[PDB]
Structure formats: structure tokens, C-alpha cells
Enzyme design. Structure first.
Site, PDB file in Angstrom:
ATOM      1  N   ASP B  44      50.013  28.769  -8.380  1.00 16.41           N
ATOM      2  CA  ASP B  44      49.326  29.249  -9.578  1.00 16.41           C
ATOM      3  C   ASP B  44      48.502  28.166 -10.276  1.00 16.41           C
ATOM      4  O   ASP B  44      48.717  26.981 -10.049  1.00 16.41           O
ATOM      5  CB  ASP B  44      50.375  29.718 -10.579  1.00 16.41           C
ATOM      6  CG  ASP B  44      51.042  31.004 -10.165  1.00 16.41           C
ATOM      7  OD1 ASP B  44      52.120  31.322 -10.732  1.00 16.41           O
ATOM      8  OD2 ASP B  44      50.538  31.765  -9.300  1.00 16.41           O
ATOM      9  N   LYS B  66      42.264  32.159 -10.269  1.00 20.78           N
ATOM     10  CA  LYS B  66      40.856  32.393 -10.672  1.00 20.78           C
ATOM     11  C   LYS B  66      39.999  31.125 -10.827  1.00 20.78           C
ATOM     12  O   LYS B  66      40.223  30.315 -11.735  1.00 20.78           O
ATOM     13  CB  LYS B  66      40.776  33.253 -11.952  1.00 20.78           C
ATOM     14  CG  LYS B  66      41.586  32.730 -13.157  1.00 20.78           C
ATOM     15  CD  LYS B  66      40.755  32.741 -14.452  1.00 20.78           C
ATOM     16  CE  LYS B  66      41.613  32.369 -15.672  1.00 20.78           C
ATOM     17  NZ  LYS B  66      40.913  31.442 -16.619  1.00 20.78           N
ATOM     18  N   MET B 180      52.496  36.838 -22.423  1.00 22.58           N
ATOM     19  CA  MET B 180      51.110  37.327 -22.426  1.00 22.58           C
ATOM     20  C   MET B 180      50.760  38.202 -23.624  1.00 22.58           C
ATOM     21  O   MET B 180      50.202  39.280 -23.461  1.00 22.58           O
ATOM     22  CB  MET B 180      50.790  38.075 -21.135  1.00 22.58           C
ATOM     23  CG  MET B 180      51.228  37.320 -19.885  1.00 22.58           C
ATOM     24  SD  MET B 180      50.983  38.290 -18.420  1.00 22.58           S
ATOM     25  CE  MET B 180      52.651  38.809 -18.105  1.00 22.58           C
TER      26      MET B 180
HETATM   27  N1  LIG Z   1      54.871  26.614 -19.892  1.00 22.59           N
HETATM   28  C1  LIG Z   1      54.734  27.713 -20.610  1.00 22.59           C
HETATM   29  N2  LIG Z   1      54.770  27.641 -21.988  1.00 22.59           N
HETATM   30  C2  LIG Z   1      54.651  28.797 -22.730  1.00 22.59           C
HETATM   31  N3  LIG Z   1      54.482  30.027 -22.116  1.00 22.59           N
HETATM   32  C3  LIG Z   1      54.441  30.109 -20.764  1.00 22.59           C
HETATM   33  C4  LIG Z   1      54.561  28.955 -19.995  1.00 22.59           C
HETATM   34  N4  LIG Z   1      54.490  29.321 -18.712  1.00 22.59           N
HETATM   35  C5  LIG Z   1      54.326  30.644 -18.638  1.00 22.59           C
HETATM   36  N5  LIG Z   1      54.295  31.156 -19.894  1.00 22.59           N
HETATM   37  C6  LIG Z   1      54.143  32.595 -20.207  1.00 22.59           C
HETATM   38  O1  LIG Z   1      54.049  33.319 -18.993  1.00 22.59           O
HETATM   39  C7  LIG Z   1      52.861  34.082 -18.936  1.00 22.59           C
HETATM   40  C8  LIG Z   1      52.345  34.227 -17.499  1.00 22.59           C
HETATM   41  S1  LIG Z   1      53.099  35.522 -16.460  1.00 22.59           S
HETATM   42  C9  LIG Z   1      54.215  34.303 -15.717  1.00 22.59           C
HETATM   43  C10 LIG Z   1      55.656  34.354 -16.188  1.00 22.59           C
HETATM   44  C11 LIG Z   1      56.613  33.536 -15.339  1.00 22.59           C
HETATM   45  N6  LIG Z   1      57.017  34.299 -14.172  1.00 22.59           N
HETATM   46  C12 LIG Z   1      57.831  33.041 -16.128  1.00 22.59           C
HETATM   47  O2  LIG Z   1      58.981  33.311 -15.788  1.00 22.59           O
HETATM   48  O3  LIG Z   1      57.739  32.334 -17.128  1.00 22.59           O
HETATM   49  C13 LIG Z   1      51.952  33.339 -19.910  1.00 22.59           C
HETATM   50  O4  LIG Z   1      50.844  34.062 -20.374  1.00 22.59           O
HETATM   51  C14 LIG Z   1      52.900  32.916 -21.018  1.00 22.59           C
HETATM   52  O5  LIG Z   1      53.226  33.950 -21.924  1.00 22.59           O
END
Ligand SMILES: Nc1ncnc2c1ncn2[C@@H]1O[C@H](CSCC[C@H](N)C(=O)O)[C@@H](O)[C@H]1O
Ligand SMILES: Nc1ncnc2c1ncn2[C@@H]1O[C@H](CSCC[C@H](N)C(=O)O)[C@@H](O)[C@H]1O
Lengths: 256, 263
Positions: B44, B66, B180
Site C-alpha cells: 500500500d 494510486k 476513513m
Molecule cells: N497510521 C494511521 N494513523 C491513523 N489512521 C490510520 C493509520 N493507518 C490507517 N488508518 C486508517 O485506515 C484507513 C485506511 S483503510 C485501512 C485500514 C487498515 N486495514 C487498518 O487495520 O488499520 C485510513 O483512512 C485511516 O482512517
């Protein structure tokens, strides 16, 4: 490959051991395990990760011994150890902040000017479920998931509405009441439900059932704690995502 | 000394592996083991160099996401590519932010893997909504505050109708943890208030949890939308609602850049 923070002194790390499988330990955990002077651990699903402890320095059991120790004492032990210059590692099942009293422990710590670190862990409600081939979220199925404990003050109706997937910690003794609460809240009697006992250990065991049948099924299957209970369509995915099953002969299917 | 009874990442299979939220220390032994074995690491943007440094030399690193402006590959494209890599005999690591199964399309990927007869393993990771919030001093659970937590996506909550039943979500748990939810914070936050939540209930935004760039804003439901804009904050962020937000003042351990100390 480890240039990461050192476990210091007058200090305590509250550290997540994950649901069992060692190696679901975080590198932070492995490192802490390598350097702790004293490890105050729980009821561990795997007593395996303790093999990581440095050239025998004190192990300290903190669960049921037979009576109990109240958290107050466990917490106050940490500070006692810390004020006497140990690198203290408080070793918790799963993640320290998912229903594990970790916030309590840490509050006590600061209350006594003891510096601490939190090391997140894999929780049974997400990783454990994964070892059963059940994801807690899936696009077609749910945009919300609620994680809860069985003993309430718990807005059962709000959870019933609102939460297409429900993930339950310590809900074995009350499974009959709870499922009856969901059904009466408008959930289908026929909604799929799964019990996962000893998630992510070689002793792992799964029950696939239903809100209406859950109480009869787990009596009959003779199931026992520790178990995560999950409610909702994502249970249907186990037939398709059970990658452990696949390792022995399992023929994985397609979704609905 | 060892970590060597761990399963090999086998030729022609795919591991869906959580990288966690950022901090390389939050990798699991299994993930670190995958990284060291992989022929190809499809990752990612919501990744983070440091992890990738564990890859053996001559592993290839592929950005799945992207590039350019916005011209996206759909999820299916990423899944098919995993299948193509695996069918060619590579040991394939799909490195996902956080946990593969928490709003990260890991189910879809695995489902595609199964359809095309490719074996896979899932390797859990630390999720932003639990581990991330821990790095800001906010426990997601605390027995004086809540016996339930709800996680959600604000992704499709623009205000074309969608079915989160925001009122159920409002009554269901004292704490709500939102993924999100930045772009649609105004509408979401108004949903919750229409649902009975107090305009003053405490709220925290945690951006880039568990990285040197971590930034936190506390606020309330009513003020959330205005505040976050003025703070200049951006995704990725986790938005947490409820009384646990009050514990950050006492539990902000990463605030070991300086005393000023816990309540
Ligand atoms: N390091 C981080 N700090 C704060 N929010 C995060 C983050 N990494 C992922 N996110 C959150 O995850 C969303 C992407 S979808 C990915 C989620 C991931 N599977 C998980 O378990 O965390 C982002 O838009 C945000 O809301
Ligand atoms: N390996 C496992 N398999 C299934 N459930 C487990 C489990 N380990 C812990 N649990 C659940 O967790 C409860 C203990 S409360 C501790 C939770 C822990 N901090 C975590 O994040 O996982 C048990 O009653 C059981 O419901």
C-alpha cells in the site's frame, strides 16, 4: 534486525501477547521479552512466548491460583517492581486495551510517577477470527462492527440495529440470554453465528450455528472458554476463507 | 537467536500480511518472517519504508496503489496481479496497512485467490483503531466508560443515502471508532448528533498514528468539522468519539518528549 526502544527502569511496558500463536507477537513484544528483568503474565493460551525470556529472570503468574488477585494488587506489584529498578514487563493476553484492564494498569502507573510504554497486540476478536477464516469486515456485508463483553449496561437494541457484525468477548455463560436479546431486537433467528475457542492455537475449535440454535449447539458441542463469539453474515465466509482448513484437505468454496 | 519453526512463505502462494499502522516494531514475527522470504512485496501507499527494508535484496517492491493523480486500479486488478505472481512461482507477500481484515479489502483479495486456485495465509496486524489509538494514549475500552466499542467506515457517508443506521450506531456503544471519516466528517458528526449524541461529547483525531508524524486534535462532535479543517489535518486519521478521549491527558506516554504529565 532490532534497533528499537530499550525497556528501561523504574519502567513498565504493558505488552500484548496476541491470542496464542507466538509470532503473532510484535517485534516490540519479542524485544521486551528479551530484555525484561521480571514478567508478570496472565492465563496464557500459549506458554510458548515465555521461552523468549532472558536467561532465567523472574516469571510472575498473575491469574487464578487454584482464589484471585484483584487488579489493584497486580497494578501495585508493577510499581513495586519498577521503583526497585527492574525492567518490568506486564504481559497481557491479546491486546492490552481490548478488555484487558490495561487502561487501569497504566492509570495506576502514572499515579505513581512510573513511566510506561504500551505495546499493542493482536486481539482475539480480529486476529483469532482470522485464523477461523472469518473477517470482521467485508464490503458486501458490513460497514460497522461492534466489539463487546458479556458480564449489563449495554444498549442491546442499538447494537442489534446499527451493527451488522457483532464480536463478543466473555459471552459463553450468557450466550442464551444474549442471542435472545438480539432476536427480540429484530435479528433473524436464522442469522449465522460462530464460536471460536482457542483461536490461533493448535487447540483451535469452531462451531457454526445460528442465533436461535446457539445455546443448544454449544451445550451439545461441549465448548468452553476462551471463545470469541461472532454474529452476522461474515460467518458464511468461513467456508471460503478457512486457510487453515485448506492446509489439511479443505476444498474452499465461493462466497454466497 | 531463532524464529525458525515459523511457516515458510511457499513458492506459488500469497500471504495477506498486516504491516500495522506505521511503527516497524508493530510488525508481527510472522510478518517480519514473510518480508525476509518474499520474492515480491505488493504494498500500500498506506505503507512506510522502514518495514520494506526487511525484504531480502533483489526482492521486488510493487506499489499497488494510486499514482500520478487519481487514476486508480480497481481492487480486482490488484487481486489478479497477485494471482499472476503466484501462478509464475513467486513467494508473494501482499503487505497491507494495519490488519488485512479491518476495512482493508483482504476478504476480497483472498476470495479472488481462492477462485483462481492459489493457496494463501492471513497474517493479522495491528489495526489503526486499536493500536493507533494506543499510541495517542486512548484505550478503545475501559470498564468505567464502555462495555462495547463500534468500529466504522465513514467512506460512503457523504449524505447519496447509504445504510449505516446512524441512530443504532449512536446508542450501541459509548465509544465509536471511525476509519476513513475525514472527508465526510461534517455529515457523520451531524448523523451522530441527530442520533442523540451530545454536541459536546469529546472527540479525538489521530493522524498518522504510530509514526514520527503523529498528530492529535481533541475537540467535540459539534466542533469537530471546523476544528479539523483549521488544524490542517489530513488522512490517514482515526476519529474516536467518547469518554475514553479524556484519558489521553493521563495516558499520553509518547508524550515522553516532555513531562507535562498525566492526570
Ligand atoms: N497510521 C494511521 N494513523 C491513523 N489512521 C490510520 C493509520 N493507518 C490507517 N488508518 C486508517 O485506515 C484507513 C485506511 S483503510 C485501512 C485500514 C487498515 N486495514 C487498518 O487495520 O488499520 C485510513 O483512512 C485511516 O482512517
Ligand atoms: N485464543 C483465544 N481464542 C478465543 N477467544 C479468546 C482467546 N484469547 C482471548 N479470548 C477472549 O478474550 C477473553 C479474555 S478478556 C482479554 C482480551 C484480550 N486482551 C484480547 O484482546 O484478546 C476470553 O474470555 C475470550 O473471549
Amino acid at each position: 534486525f532490532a534497533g528499537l526502544p530499550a525497556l528501561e527502569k523504574g519502567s513498565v511496558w504493558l505488552v500484548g501477547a496476541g491470542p496464542g500463536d507466538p509470532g503473532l507477537l510484535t517485534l516490540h513484544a519479542a524485544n521486551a521479552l528479551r530484555q525484561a528483568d521480571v514478567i508478570v503474565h496472565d492465563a496464557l493460551v500459549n506458554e510458548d512466548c515465555l521461552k523468549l525470556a532472558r536467561p532465567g529472570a523472574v516469571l510472575e503468574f498473575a491469574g487464578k491460583r487454584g482464589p484471585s488477585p484483584k487488579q489493584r494488587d497486580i497494578s501495585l506489584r508493577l510499581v513495586e517492581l519498577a521503583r526497585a529498578g527492574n525492567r518490568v514487563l506486564r504481559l497481557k493476553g491479546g491486546d492490552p486495551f481490548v478488555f484487558g484492564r490495561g487502561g487501569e494498569e497504566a492509570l495506576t502507573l502514572v499515579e505513581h510517577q512510573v513511566p510506561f510504554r504500551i505495546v499493542p497486540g493482536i486481539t482475539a476478536g480480529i486476529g483469532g477470527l482470522a485464523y477461523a477464516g472469518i473477517p470482521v469486515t467485508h464490503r458486501e456485508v458490513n460497514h460497522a462492527v461492534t466489539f463487546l463483553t458479556g458480564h449489563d449496561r449495554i444498549n442491546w437494541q442499538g447494537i442489534a440495529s446499527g451493527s451488522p457484525v457483532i464480536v463478543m468477548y466473555m459471552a459463553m455463560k450468557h450466550i442464551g440470554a444474549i442471542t435472545a436479546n438480539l432476536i427480540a431486537g429484530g435479528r433473524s433467528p436464522d442469522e449465522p453465528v460462530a464460536f471460536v475457542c482457542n483461536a490461533a492455537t493448535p487447540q483451535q475449535a469452531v462451531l457454526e450455528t445460528t442465533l436461535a440454535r446457539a445455546e443448544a449447539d454449544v451445550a451439545a458441542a461441549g465448548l468452553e472458554p476462551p471463545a470469541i463469539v461472532v454474529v452476522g453474515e461474515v460467518v458464511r465466509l468461513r467456508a471460503a476463507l478457512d486457510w487453515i482448513g485448506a492446509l489439511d484437505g479443505r476444498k474452499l468454496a465461493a462466497d454466497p
